[PDB]
Design a protein around this ligand. Sequence first.
Ligand SMILES: [Mg+2]
Ligand SMILES: [Mg+2]
Ligand SMILES: [Mg+2]
Ligand SMILES: [Mg+2]
Lengths: 162, 162
Amino acid sequence: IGLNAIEMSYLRQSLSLSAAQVGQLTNHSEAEVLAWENAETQAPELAQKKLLDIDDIIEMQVLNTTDGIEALFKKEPKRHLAFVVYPTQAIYTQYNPEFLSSLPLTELYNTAAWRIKKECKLVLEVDVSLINLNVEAYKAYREQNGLSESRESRAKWAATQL
Amino acid sequence: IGLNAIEMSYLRQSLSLSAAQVGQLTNHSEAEVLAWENAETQAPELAQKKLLDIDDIIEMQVLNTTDGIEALFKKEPKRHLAFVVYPTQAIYTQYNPEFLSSLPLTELYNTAAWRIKKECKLVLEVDVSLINLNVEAYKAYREQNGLSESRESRAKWAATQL
Ligand SMILES: [Mg+2]
Ligand SMILES: [Mg+2]
Ligand SMILES: [Mg+2]
Ligand SMILES: [Mg+2]
């Protein structure tokens, strides 16, 4: 069953995307997106699939991350954890080459992060703080601890920000 | 403590609200909301609680509605369902006096509707389509079929749209 006007609008909003961003993602103009969100046209099936696929990707990330936290908790039962997020699109792109193909926009990663925070609270009773990467503080921390720039080093830094 | 800038921003966006709408809900200016979302200021405790309470109310509505749909289909055959939503603030207000103190804005009810559609599909493999109330058509439908104004009557009308 195809997605209608309201559904496409609320799918978009659940992803923290603007209409223009959806246009860019689906190869349509902002006006075309607004039209289908106003029921003035039916969204092309490829456009629907693109947004559904992104939501599916985020959902997998939420489940996978929560599973990871749970498995780690079985060895180290810490109930306060950091999850690193990125302050701007530019820094997101610079630091996260492996998310860009499926989640090219920092808004998408932030959306996943919020959903992970919510899920961990509900299912694991773990408090996940969303920690914006502070590049200067992070660099200075790496220099003090002889760390190279990696996801693991970002995490280690983030943990000090709780 | 409490919610930080990024957490408040993505909580807001998950509720499909503009910064101005958060301002209206929490009795602060739009500029103030944007300032806390950019970590220039801290969101007041009362503002955080308003949004978190709204999210909890929606979440309860999602679980209870989906469970209610499952029970319904223990008694009659599973079918593609319509779910009524309200296209303007005025229309939402007119038809939902009992939701207004808890979900004051129609965007919140739409958000609940979208989450219900998603949950029904994933957990029950049940298809739900969102249908905006059209006042003129609904009124004529009630007259033709001898129905009084009720949520059940709105739902019966919405099924004719599928
Ligand atoms: Mg087009
Ligand atoms: Mg696909
Ligand atoms: Mg879950
Ligand atoms: Mg249940």
